[PDB]
Amino acid sequence: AKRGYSFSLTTFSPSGKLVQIEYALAAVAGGAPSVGIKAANGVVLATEKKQKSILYDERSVHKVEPITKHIGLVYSGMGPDYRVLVHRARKLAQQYYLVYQEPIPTAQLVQRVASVMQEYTQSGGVRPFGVSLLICGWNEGRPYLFQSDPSGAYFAWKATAMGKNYVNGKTFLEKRYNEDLELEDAIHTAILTLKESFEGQMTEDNIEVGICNEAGFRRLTPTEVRDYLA
Amino acid sequence: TQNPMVTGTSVLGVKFDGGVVIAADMLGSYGSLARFRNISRIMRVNDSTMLGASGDYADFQYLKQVLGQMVIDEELLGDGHSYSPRAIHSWLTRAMYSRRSKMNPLWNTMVIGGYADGESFLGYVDMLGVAYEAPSLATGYGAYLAQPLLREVLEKQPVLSQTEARELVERCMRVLYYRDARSYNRFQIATVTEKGVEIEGPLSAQTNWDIAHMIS
Amino acid sequence: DRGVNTFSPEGRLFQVEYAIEAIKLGSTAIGIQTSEGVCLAVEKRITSPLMEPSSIEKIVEIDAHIGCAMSGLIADAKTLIDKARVETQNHWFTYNETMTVESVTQAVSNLALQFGEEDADPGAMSRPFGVALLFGGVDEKGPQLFHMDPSGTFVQCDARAIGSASEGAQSSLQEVYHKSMTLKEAIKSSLIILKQVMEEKLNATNIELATVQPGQNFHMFTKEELEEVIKDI
Amino acid sequence: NQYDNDVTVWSPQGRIHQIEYAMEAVKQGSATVGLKSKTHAVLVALKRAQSELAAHQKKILHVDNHIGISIAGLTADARLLCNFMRQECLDSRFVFDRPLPVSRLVSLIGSKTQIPTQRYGRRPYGVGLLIAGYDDMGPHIFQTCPSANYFDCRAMSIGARSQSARTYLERHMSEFMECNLDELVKHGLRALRETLPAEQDLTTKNVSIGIVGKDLEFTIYDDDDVSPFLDGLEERPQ
Amino acid sequence: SSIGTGYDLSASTFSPDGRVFQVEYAMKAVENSSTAIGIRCKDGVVFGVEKLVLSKLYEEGSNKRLFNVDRHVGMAVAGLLADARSLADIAREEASNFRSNFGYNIPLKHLADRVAMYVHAYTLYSAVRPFGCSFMLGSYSANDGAQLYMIDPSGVSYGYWGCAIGKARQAAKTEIEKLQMKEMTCRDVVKEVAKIIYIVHDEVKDKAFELELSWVGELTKGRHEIVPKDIREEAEKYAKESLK
Amino acid sequence: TTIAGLVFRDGVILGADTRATNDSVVADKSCEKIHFIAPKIYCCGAGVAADTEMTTRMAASKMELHALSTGREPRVATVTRILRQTLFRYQGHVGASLVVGGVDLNGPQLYEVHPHGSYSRLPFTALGSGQGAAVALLEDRFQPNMTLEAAQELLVEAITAGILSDLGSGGNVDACVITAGGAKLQRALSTPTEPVQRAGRYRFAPGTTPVLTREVRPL
Amino acid sequence: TTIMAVEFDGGVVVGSDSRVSAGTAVVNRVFDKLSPLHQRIFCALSGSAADAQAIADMAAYQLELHGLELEEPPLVLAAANVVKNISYKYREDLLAHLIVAGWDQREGGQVYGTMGGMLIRQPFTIGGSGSSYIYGYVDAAYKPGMTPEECRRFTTNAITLAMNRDGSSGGVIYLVTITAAGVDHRVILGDELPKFYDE
Amino acid sequence: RFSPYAFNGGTVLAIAGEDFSIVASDTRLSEGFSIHTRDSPKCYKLTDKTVIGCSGFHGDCLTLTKIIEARLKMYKHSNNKAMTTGAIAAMLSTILYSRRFFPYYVYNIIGGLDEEGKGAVYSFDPVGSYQRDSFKAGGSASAMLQPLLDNQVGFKNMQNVEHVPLTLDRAMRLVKDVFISAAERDVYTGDALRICIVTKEGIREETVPLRKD
Numbered sequence A: 001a002k003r004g005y006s007f008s009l010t011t012f013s014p015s016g017k018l019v020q021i022e023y024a025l026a027a028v029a030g031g032a033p034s035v036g037i038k039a040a041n042g043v044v045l046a047t048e049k050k051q052k053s054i055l056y057d058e059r060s061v062h063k064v065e066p067i068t069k070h071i072g073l074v075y076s077g078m079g080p081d082y083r084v085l086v087h088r089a090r091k092l093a094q095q096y097y098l099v100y101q102e103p104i105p106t107a108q109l110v111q112r113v114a115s116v117m118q119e120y121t122q123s124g125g126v127r128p129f130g131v132s133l134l135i136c137g138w139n140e141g142r143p144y145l146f147q148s149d150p151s152g153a154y155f156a157w158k159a160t161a162m163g164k165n166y167v168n169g170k171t172f173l174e175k176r177y178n179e180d181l182e183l184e185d186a187i188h189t190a191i192l193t194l195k196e197s198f199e200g201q202m203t204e205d206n207i208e209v210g211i212c213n214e215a216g217f218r219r220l221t222p223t224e225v226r227d228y229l230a
Numbered sequence B: 001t002q003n004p005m006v007t008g009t010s011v012l013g014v015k016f017d018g019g020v021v022i023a024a025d026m027l028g029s030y031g032s033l034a035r036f037r038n039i040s041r042i043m044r045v046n047d048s049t050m051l052g053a054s055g056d057y058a059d060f061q062y063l064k065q066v067l068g069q070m071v072i073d074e075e076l077l078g079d080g081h082s083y084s085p086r087a088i089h090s091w092l093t094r095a096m097y098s099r100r101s102k103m104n105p106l107w108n109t110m111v112i113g114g115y116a117d118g119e120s121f122l123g124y125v126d127m128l129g130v131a132y133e134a135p136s137l138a139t140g141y142g143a144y145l146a147q148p149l150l151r152e153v154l155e156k157q158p159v160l161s162q163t164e165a166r167e168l169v170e171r172c173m174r175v176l177y178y179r180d181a182r183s184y185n186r187f188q189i190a191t192v193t194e195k196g197v198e199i200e201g202p203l204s205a206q207t208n209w210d211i212a213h214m215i216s
Numbered sequence C: 001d002r003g004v005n006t007f008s009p010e011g012r013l014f015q016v017e018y019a020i021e022a023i024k025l026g027s028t029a030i031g032i033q034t035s036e037g038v039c040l041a042v043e044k045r046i047t048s049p050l051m052e053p054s055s056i057e058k059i060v061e062i063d064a065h066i067g068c069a070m071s072g073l074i075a076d077a078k079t080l081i082d083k084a085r086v087e088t089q090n091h092w093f094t095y096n097e098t099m100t101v102e103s104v105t106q107a108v109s110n111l112a113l114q115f116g117e118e119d120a121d122p123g124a125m126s127r128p129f130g131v132a133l134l135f136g137g138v139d140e141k142g143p144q145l146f147h148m149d150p151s152g153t154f155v156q157c158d159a160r161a162i163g164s165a166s167e168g169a170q171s172s173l174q175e176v177y178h179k180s181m182t183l184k185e186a187i188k189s190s191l192i193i194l195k196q197v198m199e200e201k202l203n204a205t206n207i208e209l210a211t212v213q214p215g216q217n218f219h220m221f222t223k224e225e226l227e228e229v230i231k232d233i
Numbered sequence D: 001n002q003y004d005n006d007v008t009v010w011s012p013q014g015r016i017h018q019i020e021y022a023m024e025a026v027k028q029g030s031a032t033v034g035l036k037s038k039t040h041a042v043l044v045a046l047k048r049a050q051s052e053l054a055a056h057q058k059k060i061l062h063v064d065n066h067i068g069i070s071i072a073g074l075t076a077d078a079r080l081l082c083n084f085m086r087q088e089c090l091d092s093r094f095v096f097d098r099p100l101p102v103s104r105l106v107s108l109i110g111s112k113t114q115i116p117t118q119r120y121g122r123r124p125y126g127v128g129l130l131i132a133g134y135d136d137m138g139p140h141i142f143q144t145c146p147s148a149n150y151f152d153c154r155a156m157s158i159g160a161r162s163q164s165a166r167t168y169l170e171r172h173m174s175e176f177m178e179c180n181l182d183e184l185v186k187h188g189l190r191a192l193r194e195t196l197p198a199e200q201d202l203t204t205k206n207v208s209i210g211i212v213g214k215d216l217e218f219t220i221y222d223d224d225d226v227s228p229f230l231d232g233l234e235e236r237p238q
Numbered sequence E: 001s002s003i004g005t006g007y008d009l010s011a012s013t014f015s016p017d018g019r020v021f022q023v024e025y026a027m028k029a030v031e032n033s034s035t036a037i038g039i040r041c042k043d044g045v046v047f048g049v050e051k052l053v054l055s056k057l058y059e060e061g062s063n064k065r066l067f068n069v070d071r072h073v074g075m076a077v078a079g080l081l082a083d084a085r086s087l088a089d090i091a092r093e094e095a096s097n098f099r100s101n102f103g104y105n106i107p108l109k110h111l112a113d114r115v116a117m118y119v120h121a122y123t124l125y126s127a128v129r130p131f132g133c134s135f136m137l138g139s140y141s142a143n144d145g146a147q148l149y150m151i152d153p154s155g156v157s158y159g160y161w162g163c164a165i166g167k168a169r170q171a172a173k174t175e176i177e178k179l180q181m182k183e184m185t186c187r188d189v190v191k192e193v194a195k196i197i198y199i200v201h202d203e204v205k206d207k208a209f210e211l212e213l214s215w216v217g218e219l220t221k222g223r224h225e226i227v228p229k230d231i232r233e234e235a236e237k238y239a240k241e242s243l244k
Numbered sequence F: 001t002t003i004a005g006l007v008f009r010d011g012v013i014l015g016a017d018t019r020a021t022n023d024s025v026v027a028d029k030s031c032e033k034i035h036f037i038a039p040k041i042y043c044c045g046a047g048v049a050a051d052t053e054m055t056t057r058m059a060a061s062k063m064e065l066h067a068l069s070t071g072r073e074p075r076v077a078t079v080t081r082i083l084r085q086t087l088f089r090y091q092g093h094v095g096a097s098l099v100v101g102g103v104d105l106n107g108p109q110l111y112e113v114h115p116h117g118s119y120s121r122l123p124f125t126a127l128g129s130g131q132g133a134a135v136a137l138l139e140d141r142f143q144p145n146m147t148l149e150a151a152q153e154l155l156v157e158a159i160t161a162g163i164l165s166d167l168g169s170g171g172n173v174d175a176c177v178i179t180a181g182g183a184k185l186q187r188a189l190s191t192p193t194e195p196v197q198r199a200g201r202y203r204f205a206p207g208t209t210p211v212l213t214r215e216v217r218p219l
Numbered sequence G: 001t002t003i004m005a006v007e008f009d010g011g012v013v014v015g016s017d018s019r020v021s022a023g024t025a026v027v028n029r030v031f032d033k034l035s036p037l038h039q040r041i042f043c044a045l046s047g048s049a050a051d052a053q054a055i056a057d058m059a060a061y062q063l064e065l066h067g068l069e070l071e072e073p074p075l076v077l078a079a080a081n082v083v084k085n086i087s088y089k090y091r092e093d094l095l096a097h098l099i100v101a102g103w104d105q106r107e108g109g110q111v112y113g114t115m116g117g118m119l120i121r122q123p124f125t126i127g128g129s130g131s132s133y134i135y136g137y138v139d140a141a142y143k144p145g146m147t148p149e150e151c152r153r154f155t156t157n158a159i160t161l162a163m164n165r166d167g168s169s170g171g172v173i174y175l176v177t178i179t180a181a182g183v184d185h186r187v188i189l190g191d192e193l194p195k196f197y198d199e
Numbered sequence H: 001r002f003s004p005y006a007f008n009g010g011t012v013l014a015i016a017g018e019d020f021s022i023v024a025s026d027t028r029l030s031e032g033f034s035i036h037t038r039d040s041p042k043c044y045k046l047t048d049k050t051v052i053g054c055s056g057f058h059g060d061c062l063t064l065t066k067i068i069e070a071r072l073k074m075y076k077h078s079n080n081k082a083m084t085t086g087a088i089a090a091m092l093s094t095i096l097y098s099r100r101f102f103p104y105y106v107y108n109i110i111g112g113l114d115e116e117g118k119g120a121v122y123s124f125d126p127v128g129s130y131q132r133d134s135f136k137a138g139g140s141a142s143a144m145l146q147p148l149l150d151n152q153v154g155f156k157n158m159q160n161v162e163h164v165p166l167t168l169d170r171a172m173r174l175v176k177d178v179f180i181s182a183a184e185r186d187v188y189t190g191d192a193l194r195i196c197i198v199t200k201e202g203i204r205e206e207t208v209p210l211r212k213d
Ligand SMILES: *[C@@](C)(CO)[C@](*)(O)[C@H](Cc1ccccc1)NC(=O)[C@H](Cc1ccc(OC)cc1)NC(=O)[C@H](C)NC(=O)CN1CCOCC1
Pocket: F001, F002, F019, F020, F021, F022, F023, F027, F031, F032, F033, F045, F046, F047, F048, F049, F050, F052, F053, F095, F128, F129, F168, F169
């Protein structure tokens, strides 16, 4: 028999800093790198899926996930925590569809998912999520890219990177990213930002990439990733 | 239970010198239909108290399991204590009234026979919680048919030998078979004594149909 | 740091022992069980001549035949007193009779160690009551006086004192008690012992005096009547 | 110590200190003695006064017509356990119409007293009881503690200086089985006497007696009702 | 072998070397208790327990360490007896629930499996402490044969031919290995069970003792019960005289 | 409503009329009754309109969520069990009679599920107030392993029969073919009734309606 | 419905009609009322279709878990008990009789009736609305110690006779035979039904 | 449907004198047109000072007597004394009213002594309305018992009778007579009559045979 703790595990330090959120930020800043790029006619999301052994089945688990027909996800941080947020995101997307009969605006999903993240910075007996989310979407004929993080704060991006070498990946994008890309160009500059932080040789098995357009959201097949890897 | 499905008719009880004897026919009816003509409506609770039950059979089988477990639980402790016939009677009374008060009754009438401390026990339990003790017991149509017979004999002879009780019971089952449309000619006799509970196999009462020729 | 239901190596609950200590800061109160009645007396402890005299109530009425003297944390006591008053009237409703002084004290004693943190209600007690109580009254077993502390323990007393000067007043009662004392001597003794153990002089407005005797009900003394018992110093 | 603030914390030695701290509360209370013959079960307890002006504490309590207890330790924990025992005895009579066998009642205490020792924020019961009862199996003397453990005993003593009483009974335990009731109570009183310092002995004000058996229901004699037992006293020797 | 201050207070806290000390300290409580024994024979299972007489004022038969959990199932306990009784109550309810749901006597292995789940549940949280005892479960039927299981504070359960728990679990096991129990009748096994308890017993540290004995085999018709005063005393005499 | 289902060689086919009634008056002449569940699983709803609407949308919502979590082609047997356990919980108070049809790794499948939560798997079925007309046509002309076009025509005839014989049925016959390759939702496949043409003009020259108050809000 | 089960030496035989009805209309003329609860335990369905099927699912659910926990094929007694318990707990809310028959290593081939929440083992059992019209036939046509083929004919004959008389019974006869070796499922079609007096 | 009540008959009578109380009843338990048992007295000892008589639905009467029994013990452990006649009557009122919306089909009469040793009688309805009185009857034949007591004990409708105080002897015959009359007319009254006499000495029971038809 059990009954949980009812007190917050995230409190204010004398400096005015919620240390557990910043400590959760350290968990994502140390995870595998991930990049998202808004590209005028679509969105691209790519991640390092280096399992660091040939024994793994590269096809079994995925890091780039669909939330609905028009929304996708990537993360940097803890895999298990991310899974919780995916499941919650998918349910929120359906809850919205059932009520309004209209694909959830990406902005509205992110707000709802970010609020779940906020809970774990104030609720009792729990630690915050050690994951930052990168959410892409297409609604009203416009591409969207959003970032959610352990704080429960959310941001809108033209392009960004997170995880290992997120600082170097960001400056690279500042110089490299220009508005009004075509989607197929964005997959290149996404894989290029990923190459900056890699360490090893890139095969279509080592990285995972998803795309979002007017036709919806899908993850690229291993054969498609190979064709961009040249 | 709001509406009983499979029912049993009258259960008989009467106490002789050095024990108690219980009778009930092996029939389970579905309305007027005789559905199961070889099922037992009697049980051995322990070695001192026994039970025959009228009404809904599923409710009887439920009460049979609950009482069965209670006896097992008590045997596990092995503290020199066991349920007396009165204790089982008191429990059953409390159980029926409780279920009745929640408007969800166990659809049963019960006869509890027992022998303890040199004294014979015979107790009645209703589905509404009506409980008492009597030298002779008959439920359902038995209360109208068999009970008059038993009382008329017990008035003339209060103490009966086990043999006298047995033949009186067989005589009552004869009347019940003739007069109850919800009865059958297969029945059991249960007996408590110093030695314990003894349930006897399928019995038939002797019938006579010679009055079928006396209509001319 | 520990929980509220923690035993000392000695064998006592810390919060109880600490609640006993809180009473040692409360103003002194005396009860005397006379064969012809019970008298309760207490010091008010005026902090300023601006405070209203009859405003402090450290001796209250529970029932027609029961009086209660209180010491320690006054705020804790008045929660317990309402509970005592509720019990008498619940009992009156159900049984059409007045409760015994023992049963009333026993009822309040049931709330004793009903405190805790985990495995408890939203409004369950967090700590004990920093209060000692003197239940004095007349039932069908003659006049009686009972003493109760935060441990829950309650016992009859022929005479008892509780508060800051507890041991001093206890010794003063010890050498000045006959089980055959009159009520005149009973009020006198309590008034005599009270001035000895106090930091302030005995005034008519400085103290509360109460009597529960067989014939008449519990009585709160009026300033003029107090001046007749303080006439015999 | 840091293994001694909660019941849910095991000591490295393999022990629970908070149970043992509660066991100390029993030893601080005044002594009480329980013993039985083949027909009767007798409780003898020492009432205590905090001052001479206050009355003596109640030590022996009613449970049912066939069961009685003497307490040692915290008052509220004793009163709480007494009310549980009474409620169990009431439910037994309400349902089965027959008195609850002593063995089973004690088993229920053993099960109930165990619960708080295993849950965080809870605490052990700060009282030990001596239970005298009569049922189908004859007279019984039982012992309960802050630890949920319980014992079936021929005779027992718990409280302050109960070791002296324990040794007295241990010498005369073979005596009790053929004892007359009047001789049985004197044995109980004589053991209780050993607990007191040499200066003082048993008085009519500080001795409480509880008796249950084949003859009668559980009865408590306190003051005037107690002197018949005290009178006829072999003198305090050394 | 132990960890101070931090990592050994709660069962919801792992130690740096991957250990739950709260379970291990509860495992220490049983190691301090007097020895309980039980070995599987050809036609049943026998139990033997040394019961240390704390005081001669206690009744012969008090503090029973052999329980009836179900008509066909017997329990032998070692450790904090207060916990041992609650687990005996939990085990009883489980055997009762099984019959209520499925209509027949609980298979012993499953009974052990079920009670073990309950024990284990008290090893995961700060809200509760682990059970401070270890216990054995023995049964016999013609279908399943003789079966013997033992559960410890962690929630682990295994089958046995011979098993012992408590003070001298080691002294007992080496004495059990000597027996050809796979071929021995349960009437014989009692004699040997009785002598191993006597050998195991420390008569110079512990003051004195009583011997508890249990049945569950063909001679009892599949029902678990106590070994009669007659058969016990023959085995007690056997124990004292082959001690030389 | 008339709704029907049919199994053929290469897959399944579902049918429906387009009429909705409020009391005994035709509310909607062109309402859709063949509902999307998965890309290759579809459901026809008969009974209480709002009830067949919400149950079907709820099922589709749970089916997309299931496909997302498994990364696999949704199973029609999953749809059928989700549906019936939902409906059984409501004890028939949700008046939704459903014909669910689709394609799995286990081939073409057709189920019917009643409001109380009972189900059956079969080659052909019909639900709604015009079900009698449809089964009549099916029992008459159904064969195992029919060609798509032979199966499409019989289904049209079954729904047509329902439309013409049932007063609670009308409008167009909607069809949905599901193949191991894909699903074609042939809305208004056949349309029996036509009267849109007329010769009665009832216009009113601006100012025939007498007005007391006028207010204009600029935007 | 008409449903039936018969016990033989090596195992059991379970039969049913293939009709489901709503009022005077038949909504399914080919429905199999023989649901597996485990690998060698089947049950015969009657009464409310939704109520019956719901009981069948929960029974099959619990017996799967119970089977894994014992690491052995569930006892037919155990199976009957779980169906009996659900039927009793909701006797006012669930309206269906389920015959449970099967085979296990402990007790061989067994037949159980659970109507209303009671439990009884019988040498053979009939159920459903059509059972009324064949009570006389089964009493007269029964022999103890029938071969698998004889039991197969006995159930077929009795169900044929019931279906012709009962308006709520119709279609085909579904037969399953459960032995140690396995389950044999066969269907008796319209042309193959035994002929009797029909006038 | 299903009825939670059965009618089992039984009449109960109580009379108060200077130092005594009488509670009397028939021994007949019945249901429909059949007698359950001829040996069912309705009087019940609660204390040495107080006796209760319950009639109506026997299932309710049994459970209610057991509630009172338990409640009597609860009181004495809590208060250190016996529950007085007036206290039991006050408690019974509240117990019966807690079932105001699902009542005990029960007719209770309480007989005993007050704290001054004087005879006390308390009459109840199924729902708990009660008062003290000199004499009262409850049950199936209460209307048969009442008027005779009104005339003889109350001295009602009489002109120059000197108003003699009630004696035990006279009340005993009165109790016997009204039941003899009722047994002749009420089909639910017969078999035997049991009288419970409450006095300072205690409870004495007396049995007189009645019509057995
Ligand atoms: C045919 C047309 C009826 O013969 C179909 O069953 C059709 C089903 C359908 C319609 C639109 C979309 C999907 C599926 N049913 C209706 O047209 C239905 C009629 C109906 C009314 C009352 C009923 O009894 C409870 C059952 C069916 N249409 C409606 O529900 C209309 C829009 N609303 C109402 O009539 C109002 N109802 C709401 C429920 O409570 C009774 C009153």
